[PDB]
Design a protein around this ligand. Sequence first.
Ligand SMILES: [Zn+2]
Length: 169
Amino acid sequence: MLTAIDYLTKKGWKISSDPRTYDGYPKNYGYRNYHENGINYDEFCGGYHRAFDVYSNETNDVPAVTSGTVIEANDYGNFGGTFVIRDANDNDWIYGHLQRGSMRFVVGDKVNQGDIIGLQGNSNYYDNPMSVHLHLQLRPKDAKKDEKSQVCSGLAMEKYDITNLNAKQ
Ligand SMILES: [Zn+2]
């Protein structure tokens, strides 16, 4: 089985936040409660971070980890510069904190796995201090449309096979 994480670490990306390391795992998935220096980073999600933060020193091109359709390409989304791909399973890959104005696609575009979709960055809603990284989250198909479920819902990416989600578009 190949995960989006396996895909990224083979290309030299490294993991800054890994829900398999949070206390209680596999229980209480994504419970992170990351706060420092007066910023509570998981405040909006009641401390939950159902997602992987990864980063690269080598380059800043962010590759699409699966193929699919662009459904959100927002410079000022909830994760700063927010880019979302819906894959063949109709789950939504959230790419967050991209350099605003770096997105290479618009809503409706088709994307092949590995296509460069934007640049790694540190943009966020309130424009607070943040380290340059990619936030990658797999929002499920059955995510409620209410805002907290569009931002905080998340599948366990480490259990999600992408071996067959790379079809040519
Ligand atoms: Zn994150």
